[PDB]
């Protein structure tokens, strides 16, 4: 179909590579926000529950 449009199929290669990097960017970003949220949660729970988060950081 891109040959029907008269372009290079190299453009289709570029677009498949770009969509691969787009999905990898989105997934790494979601995992990074989960990392920041876990860090914030353990900070605030260590503020409010000292001994329990101490034993959790011990056990890990």
């Amino acid at each position: 179909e891109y040959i029907d449009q008269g372009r290079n199929p190299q453009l289709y290669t570029k677009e498949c590579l770009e969509r691969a990097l787009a999905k990898n960017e989105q997934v790494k970003g979601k995992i990074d926000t989960m990392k920041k949220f876990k860090s914030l949660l353990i900070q605030e729970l260590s503020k409010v529950f000292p001994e329990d988060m101490a034993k959790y950081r011990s056990i890990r």
């Binding site: 989960m34 990392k35 729970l45």
Partner: protein
């Protein structure tokens, strides 16, 4: 208190599942696991419900007794 802290720590371990290996088998266990914990947190406090029931009878009786004596004293003054 143990089940509260266990619920929070299993939520943190579910976050560790979602960080490390989302395709693991354990998350299904984990999405079952804290469910069982939540069931117990309800099942313990439902066991406060007969006790609360019995206890409200007790305080009702005390209030009942007090009101009788108050009316008695009120009437005697009159």
């Amino acid at each position: 208190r143990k089940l509260n802290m266990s619920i929070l720590i299993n939520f943190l371990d579910l976050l560790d599942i979602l960080i490390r290996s989302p395709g693991s088998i354990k998350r299904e266990e984990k999405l079952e696991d804290l469910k069982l914990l939540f069931v117990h947190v309800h099942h313990l406090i439902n066991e406060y419900r007969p006790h609360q029931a019995r206890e409200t009878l007790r305080v009702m009786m005390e209030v009942q007794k007090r009101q009788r004596l108050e009316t008695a004293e009120r009437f005697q003054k009159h």
